[PDB]
């Protein structure tokens, strides 16, 4: 409604939120709850847990201070993201020694 470019297509949330998502049905049903299988809740293997209903990219914020989620939209363009990282230099090694004693 507000950006005019597209509907949220991802969400980053606390572990507790995703644990709920993975333990419930998300499709249209009468009720649904059980052992969590829908998304990965294990950040060990991946931050990206899965896709909610085939519609949203679900990720885990492993450092949530308490418990929340953020939903947002990122389009095919790069400006149409709201936020952007525009590197000029990246992961460039630095190499030498201290000539006095040759320590690296």
């Amino acid at each position: 409604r507000q950006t005019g470019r597209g509907e949220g297509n991802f969400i980053i949330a606390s572990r507790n939120v995703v644990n709920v998502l993975a333990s419930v049905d998300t499709g249209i049903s009468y009720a649904a709850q059980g052992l969590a299988t829908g998304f990965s809740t294990d950040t060990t293997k991946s931050v990206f847990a899965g896709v909610l209903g085939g519609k949203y990219r679900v990720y885990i914020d492993q450092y949530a201070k308490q418990d929340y989620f953020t939903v947002g939209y990122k389009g095919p363009n790069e400006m149409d993201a709201g936020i952007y990282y525009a590197p000029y230099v990246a992961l460039t090694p630095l190499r030498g020694s201290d000539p006095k004693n040759f320590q690296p």
């Binding site: 005019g4 470019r5 363009n77 790069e78 400006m79 149409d80 952007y84 525009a86």
Partner: peptide, 14 residues
Amino acid sequence: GPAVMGMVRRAIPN
């Protein structure tokens, strides 16, 4: 003379 990273124009609704 900064680089131009692109431009955006407001989208047209259907």
